[PDB]
Amino acid sequence: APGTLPHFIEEPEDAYIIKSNPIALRCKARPAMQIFFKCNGEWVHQNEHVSEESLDLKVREVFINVTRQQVEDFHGPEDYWCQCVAWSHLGTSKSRKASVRIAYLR
């Protein structure tokens, strides 16, 4: 009090690519002035982010597209993950790490 750090209304959920169709990672936080995705320790490019700002304090909603080509090119130790970082005047707030793996239908 009086200020508050960004509280996530919607956190990124674990998604699956079926088949070669791109997935969208939903993220919503309040109060937030900037919201950016951090996939596998590296910051995602600003042009890949689709922002949607509204007033209720400032509410921000950001969506990112993760294709099959992006996941297959990554050959790390664990599964392909994406985390949401929201900015405010007092600081930052990190959401849960959402995993994205390529699936195959029966």
Coordinates of N, CA, C and O in Angstrom, one line a residue:
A1 N 0.8 -1.2 0.0 CA 0.0 0.0 0.0 C 0.9 1.3 0.0 O 1.9 1.3 0.7
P2 N 0.5 2.3 -0.8 CA -0.6 2.5 -1.7 C -0.5 1.7 -3.0 O -1.6 1.3 -3.6
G3 N 0.7 1.6 -3.6 CA 0.9 0.9 -4.8 C 0.9 -0.6 -4.7 O 1.1 -1.2 -3.6
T4 N 0.7 -1.3 -5.8 CA 0.6 -2.7 -5.9 C 1.4 -3.3 -7.2 O 1.3 -2.6 -8.2
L5 N 2.1 -4.4 -7.0 CA 2.8 -5.1 -8.1 C 1.8 -5.7 -9.1 O 0.6 -5.9 -8.7
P6 N 2.2 -6.1 -10.4 CA 1.2 -6.6 -11.3 C 0.6 -8.0 -10.9 O 1.4 -8.9 -10.6
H7 N -0.7 -8.1 -10.7 CA -1.4 -9.4 -10.4 C -1.9 -10.0 -11.7 O -2.7 -9.3 -12.4
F8 N -1.5 -11.2 -12.0 CA -1.9 -11.9 -13.1 C -3.4 -12.4 -13.1 O -3.8 -13.2 -12.2
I9 N -4.2 -11.9 -14.0 CA -5.6 -12.3 -14.1 C -5.7 -13.6 -14.9 O -6.4 -14.5 -14.5
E10 N -4.9 -13.7 -16.0 CA -4.7 -14.9 -16.8 C -3.2 -15.2 -17.0 O -2.5 -14.3 -17.5
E11 N -2.8 -16.4 -16.6 CA -1.4 -16.9 -16.7 C -1.3 -17.8 -18.0 O -2.3 -18.5 -18.3
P12 N -0.1 -17.9 -18.6 CA 0.0 -18.8 -19.8 C -0.1 -20.3 -19.4 O 0.5 -20.7 -18.4
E13 N -1.0 -21.0 -20.2 CA -1.3 -22.4 -20.0 C -0.4 -23.3 -20.9 O 0.1 -22.8 -21.9
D14 N -0.2 -24.5 -20.5 CA 0.6 -25.5 -21.2 C -0.2 -25.9 -22.5 O -1.4 -26.2 -22.4
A15 N 0.5 -25.7 -23.7 CA -0.1 -25.9 -25.0 C 0.6 -27.0 -25.8 O 1.7 -27.4 -25.5
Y16 N -0.1 -27.6 -26.8 CA 0.4 -28.7 -27.6 C 0.0 -28.4 -29.1 O -1.1 -28.0 -29.4
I17 N 1.1 -28.5 -30.0 CA 1.0 -28.2 -31.4 C 0.4 -29.5 -32.1 O 1.1 -30.5 -32.2
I18 N -0.8 -29.4 -32.7 CA -1.5 -30.5 -33.4 C -2.4 -30.0 -34.5 O -3.5 -29.5 -34.3
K19 N -1.9 -30.1 -35.8 CA -0.6 -30.6 -36.3 C 0.0 -29.5 -37.1 O -0.7 -29.0 -38.1
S20 N 1.2 -29.0 -36.8 CA 1.9 -27.9 -37.5 C 1.1 -26.5 -37.4 O 1.6 -25.5 -37.9
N21 N 0.0 -26.5 -36.7 CA -0.9 -25.4 -36.4 C -0.3 -24.5 -35.3 O 0.0 -25.1 -34.2
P22 N -0.1 -23.2 -35.4 CA 0.5 -22.4 -34.3 C -0.4 -22.3 -33.1 O -1.7 -22.1 -33.2
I23 N 0.2 -22.2 -31.9 CA -0.5 -22.0 -30.6 C -0.4 -20.6 -30.1 O 0.6 -20.0 -30.4
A24 N -1.4 -20.1 -29.4 CA -1.4 -18.8 -28.8 C -1.3 -18.8 -27.3 O -2.0 -19.6 -26.6
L25 N -0.3 -18.1 -26.7 CA -0.1 -18.0 -25.2 C -0.7 -16.8 -24.6 O -0.2 -15.7 -24.8
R26 N -1.8 -16.9 -23.9 CA -2.6 -15.9 -23.3 C -1.9 -15.4 -22.0 O -1.4 -16.2 -21.2
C27 N -1.9 -14.1 -21.8 CA -1.3 -13.4 -20.6 C -2.0 -12.1 -20.3 O -2.2 -11.3 -21.2
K28 N -2.5 -11.9 -19.1 CA -3.2 -10.7 -18.6 C -2.9 -10.4 -17.2 O -2.9 -11.3 -16.3
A29 N -2.5 -9.1 -16.9 CA -2.0 -8.6 -15.6 C -2.5 -7.2 -15.3 O -2.6 -6.4 -16.2
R30 N -2.8 -6.9 -14.0 CA -3.3 -5.7 -13.5 C -2.7 -5.4 -12.1 O -2.8 -6.2 -11.2
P31 N -2.0 -4.2 -11.9 CA -1.7 -3.1 -12.8 C -0.4 -3.3 -13.6 O 0.6 -3.6 -13.0
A32 N -0.6 -3.2 -15.0 CA 0.6 -3.4 -15.8 C 0.7 -2.4 -17.0 O -0.3 -2.1 -17.6
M33 N 1.9 -1.9 -17.2 CA 2.2 -0.9 -18.2 C 3.0 -1.6 -19.4 O 2.9 -1.2 -20.5
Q34 N 3.7 -2.7 -19.1 CA 4.5 -3.5 -20.1 C 4.4 -5.0 -19.7 O 4.5 -5.3 -18.5
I35 N 4.1 -5.9 -20.7 CA 4.0 -7.3 -20.5 C 4.8 -8.0 -21.7 O 4.5 -7.7 -22.8
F36 N 5.8 -8.8 -21.3 CA 6.7 -9.5 -22.3 C 6.9 -10.9 -21.9 O 7.1 -11.2 -20.8
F37 N 7.0 -11.8 -23.0 CA 7.3 -13.2 -22.8 C 8.8 -13.5 -22.9 O 9.6 -12.8 -23.6
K38 N 9.2 -14.5 -22.0 CA 10.6 -14.9 -21.9 C 10.6 -16.4 -22.1 O 10.3 -17.2 -21.2
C39 N 10.9 -16.8 -23.4 CA 11.0 -18.2 -23.8 C 12.4 -18.8 -23.7 O 13.3 -18.3 -24.4
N40 N 12.6 -19.8 -22.9 CA 13.8 -20.6 -22.6 C 15.0 -19.7 -22.2 O 16.1 -19.9 -22.6
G41 N 14.7 -18.7 -21.3 CA 15.7 -17.8 -20.8 C 16.0 -16.6 -21.6 O 16.6 -15.6 -21.1
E42 N 15.6 -16.6 -22.9 CA 15.8 -15.5 -23.8 C 14.5 -14.7 -24.0 O 13.4 -15.3 -24.1
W43 N 14.6 -13.3 -24.1 CA 13.5 -12.5 -24.3 C 12.9 -12.6 -25.7 O 13.7 -12.6 -26.7
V44 N 11.6 -12.7 -25.9 CA 10.9 -12.8 -27.2 C 10.9 -11.4 -27.8 O 10.6 -10.4 -27.1
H45 N 11.1 -11.3 -29.1 CA 11.1 -10.1 -29.9 C 9.8 -9.3 -29.8 O 8.7 -9.9 -29.8
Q46 N 9.9 -8.0 -29.7 CA 8.7 -7.0 -29.5 C 7.7 -7.1 -30.6 O 6.5 -6.9 -30.3
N47 N 8.1 -7.4 -31.8 CA 7.2 -7.6 -33.0 C 6.3 -8.8 -32.9 O 5.3 -8.9 -33.6
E48 N 6.7 -9.8 -32.2 CA 6.0 -11.1 -32.0 C 4.9 -11.0 -30.9 O 4.0 -11.9 -30.9
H49 N 4.9 -9.9 -30.1 CA 3.9 -9.6 -29.1 C 2.7 -8.8 -29.7 O 3.0 -7.8 -30.4
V50 N 1.5 -9.2 -29.3 CA 0.3 -8.5 -29.7 C -0.4 -8.0 -28.4 O -1.0 -8.8 -27.7
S51 N -0.2 -6.7 -28.1 CA -0.7 -6.0 -26.9 C -2.2 -5.5 -27.1 O -2.6 -5.2 -28.2
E52 N -2.9 -5.5 -25.9 CA -4.3 -5.1 -25.8 C -4.5 -4.4 -24.5 O -4.6 -5.1 -23.5
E53 N -4.3 -3.1 -24.5 CA -4.4 -2.2 -23.3 C -5.9 -1.7 -23.0 O -6.5 -1.3 -24.0
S54 N -6.3 -1.7 -21.7 CA -7.6 -1.3 -21.3 C -7.6 -0.7 -19.9 O -6.7 -0.9 -19.2
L55 N -8.7 0.0 -19.5 CA -8.8 0.7 -18.2 C -10.1 0.1 -17.5 O -11.1 -0.1 -18.1
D56 N -9.9 -0.1 -16.2 CA -11.0 -0.6 -15.3 C -11.3 0.4 -14.1 O -12.4 0.4 -13.6
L57 N -6.5 2.0 -12.7 CA -5.3 1.2 -13.1 C -5.4 0.7 -14.5 O -6.4 0.5 -15.1
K58 N -4.2 0.4 -15.1 CA -4.1 -0.1 -16.5 C -4.0 -1.6 -16.6 O -3.1 -2.2 -15.9
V59 N -4.9 -2.2 -17.4 CA -5.0 -3.6 -17.6 C -4.4 -3.9 -19.0 O -4.7 -3.2 -20.0
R60 N -3.4 -4.8 -19.1 CA -2.8 -5.2 -20.3 C -2.9 -6.7 -20.6 O -2.9 -7.5 -19.7
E61 N -3.1 -7.0 -21.9 CA -3.3 -8.4 -22.4 C -2.3 -8.6 -23.6 O -2.5 -7.9 -24.6
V62 N -1.4 -9.6 -23.5 CA -0.4 -9.9 -24.6 C -0.5 -11.4 -25.0 O -0.5 -12.3 -24.2
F63 N -0.5 -11.6 -26.3 CA -0.5 -12.9 -27.0 C 0.7 -13.1 -27.9 O 1.0 -12.2 -28.6
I64 N 1.3 -14.3 -27.8 CA 2.4 -14.7 -28.7 C 2.2 -16.0 -29.4 O 1.5 -16.9 -28.9
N65 N 2.7 -16.1 -30.7 CA 2.5 -17.3 -31.5 C 3.8 -18.2 -31.5 O 4.9 -17.7 -31.8
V66 N 3.6 -19.4 -31.1 CA 4.7 -20.4 -31.1 C 4.4 -21.5 -32.1 O 3.4 -22.3 -31.9
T67 N 5.2 -21.6 -33.2 CA 5.0 -22.6 -34.3 C 5.7 -23.9 -34.0 O 6.5 -23.9 -33.1
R68 N 5.5 -24.9 -34.8 CA 6.1 -26.2 -34.7 C 7.6 -26.1 -35.1 O 8.5 -26.7 -34.4
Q69 N 8.0 -25.2 -36.0 CA 9.3 -24.9 -36.5 C 10.2 -24.3 -35.3 O 11.4 -24.6 -35.3
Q70 N 9.6 -23.5 -34.4 CA 10.3 -22.9 -33.3 C 10.7 -23.9 -32.2 O 11.8 -23.8 -31.7
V71 N 9.8 -24.9 -31.9 CA 10.0 -25.9 -30.9 C 11.0 -27.0 -31.4 O 11.9 -27.3 -30.6
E72 N 10.9 -27.4 -32.7 CA 11.8 -28.4 -33.2 C 13.3 -28.0 -33.4 O 14.2 -28.8 -33.3
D73 N 13.5 -26.7 -33.6 CA 14.8 -26.0 -33.7 C 15.5 -25.9 -32.4 O 16.8 -25.9 -32.4
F74 N 14.8 -25.9 -31.3 CA 15.3 -25.8 -29.9 C 15.7 -27.2 -29.4 O 14.8 -28.1 -29.3
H75 N 17.0 -27.5 -29.1 CA 17.5 -28.8 -28.7 C 18.1 -28.6 -27.3 O 19.3 -29.0 -27.1
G76 N 17.4 -28.1 -26.3 CA 17.8 -27.9 -25.0 C 17.7 -29.1 -24.1 O 17.3 -30.2 -24.6
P77 N 18.1 -29.1 -22.8 CA 17.9 -30.3 -21.9 C 16.5 -30.6 -21.6 O 16.1 -31.8 -21.7
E78 N 15.7 -29.6 -21.2 CA 14.3 -29.8 -20.8 C 13.3 -29.4 -22.0 O 13.8 -28.9 -23.0
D79 N 12.0 -29.5 -21.8 CA 11.0 -29.1 -22.7 C 10.9 -27.5 -23.0 O 11.3 -26.8 -22.1
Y80 N 10.5 -27.1 -24.2 CA 10.3 -25.7 -24.6 C 9.3 -25.0 -23.7 O 8.2 -25.5 -23.6
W81 N 9.8 -24.0 -22.9 CA 8.9 -23.3 -22.0 C 8.9 -21.8 -22.3 O 9.8 -21.2 -22.9
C82 N 7.8 -21.1 -21.9 CA 7.6 -19.7 -22.0 C 7.0 -19.1 -20.7 O 6.0 -19.6 -20.2
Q83 N 7.6 -18.0 -20.2 CA 7.2 -17.3 -19.0 C 6.8 -15.9 -19.3 O 7.3 -15.3 -20.2
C84 N 5.8 -15.4 -18.6 CA 5.2 -14.0 -18.7 C 5.7 -13.1 -17.6 O 5.5 -13.3 -16.5
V85 N 6.4 -12.0 -18.0 CA 6.9 -10.9 -17.1 C 6.1 -9.6 -17.3 O 6.1 -9.1 -18.4
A86 N 5.5 -9.1 -16.2 CA 4.7 -7.9 -16.3 C 5.3 -6.8 -15.5 O 5.8 -7.0 -14.3
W87 N 5.4 -5.6 -16.1 CA 6.0 -4.4 -15.5 C 5.0 -3.4 -14.8 O 3.9 -3.3 -15.3
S88 N 5.5 -2.7 -13.8 CA 4.7 -1.7 -13.1 C 5.7 -0.6 -12.6 O 6.9 -0.8 -12.8
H89 N 5.2 0.4 -11.9 CA 6.1 1.5 -11.4 C 7.0 1.0 -10.2 O 8.1 1.4 -10.1
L90 N 6.4 0.1 -9.4 CA 7.1 -0.5 -8.2 C 8.1 -1.6 -8.6 O 9.0 -1.9 -7.8
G91 N 7.9 -2.3 -9.8 CA 8.7 -3.4 -10.2 C 8.1 -4.3 -11.2 O 7.2 -4.0 -12.0
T92 N 8.6 -5.6 -11.1 CA 8.1 -6.7 -12.0 C 7.4 -7.8 -11.2 O 7.5 -7.9 -10.0
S93 N 6.7 -8.7 -12.0 CA 6.0 -9.8 -11.5 C 6.1 -10.9 -12.6 O 5.7 -10.7 -13.7
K94 N 6.6 -12.1 -12.2 CA 6.7 -13.3 -13.1 C 5.6 -14.3 -12.9 O 5.2 -14.6 -11.7
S95 N 5.0 -14.8 -14.0 CA 4.0 -15.8 -14.0 C 4.6 -17.2 -14.0 O 5.8 -17.3 -13.8
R96 N 3.7 -18.2 -14.1 CA 4.2 -19.6 -14.2 C 4.9 -19.9 -15.6 O 4.6 -19.2 -16.5
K97 N 5.7 -20.9 -15.6 CA 6.4 -21.3 -16.9 C 5.6 -22.3 -17.6 O 5.4 -23.4 -17.1
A98 N 5.0 -21.9 -18.8 CA 4.1 -22.7 -19.6 C 4.9 -23.5 -20.6 O 5.7 -22.9 -21.4
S99 N 4.8 -24.8 -20.6 CA 5.5 -25.7 -21.5 C 4.7 -26.0 -22.8 O 3.5 -26.2 -22.8
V100 N 5.4 -26.0 -23.9 CA 4.8 -26.3 -25.3 C 5.6 -27.4 -26.0 O 6.8 -27.2 -26.3
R101 N 4.9 -28.6 -26.2 CA 5.5 -29.7 -26.9 C 4.6 -30.2 -28.1 O 3.4 -30.1 -28.0
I102 N 5.3 -30.6 -29.1 CA 4.6 -31.1 -30.4 C 4.0 -32.5 -30.1 O 4.7 -33.4 -29.7
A103 N 2.7 -32.6 -30.3 CA 1.9 -33.8 -30.1 C 1.5 -34.4 -31.5 O 1.6 -33.8 -32.5
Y104 N 1.1 -35.7 -31.4 CA 0.7 -36.5 -32.6 C -0.6 -37.2 -32.3 O -0.6 -38.0 -31.4
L105 N -1.6 -37.0 -33.2 CA -2.9 -37.6 -33.0 C -2.9 -39.1 -33.5 O -2.2 -39.4 -34.5
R106 N -3.8 -39.9 -32.9 CA -3.9 -41.3 -33.2 C -4.7 -41.5 -34.5 O -5.7 -40.9 -34.7

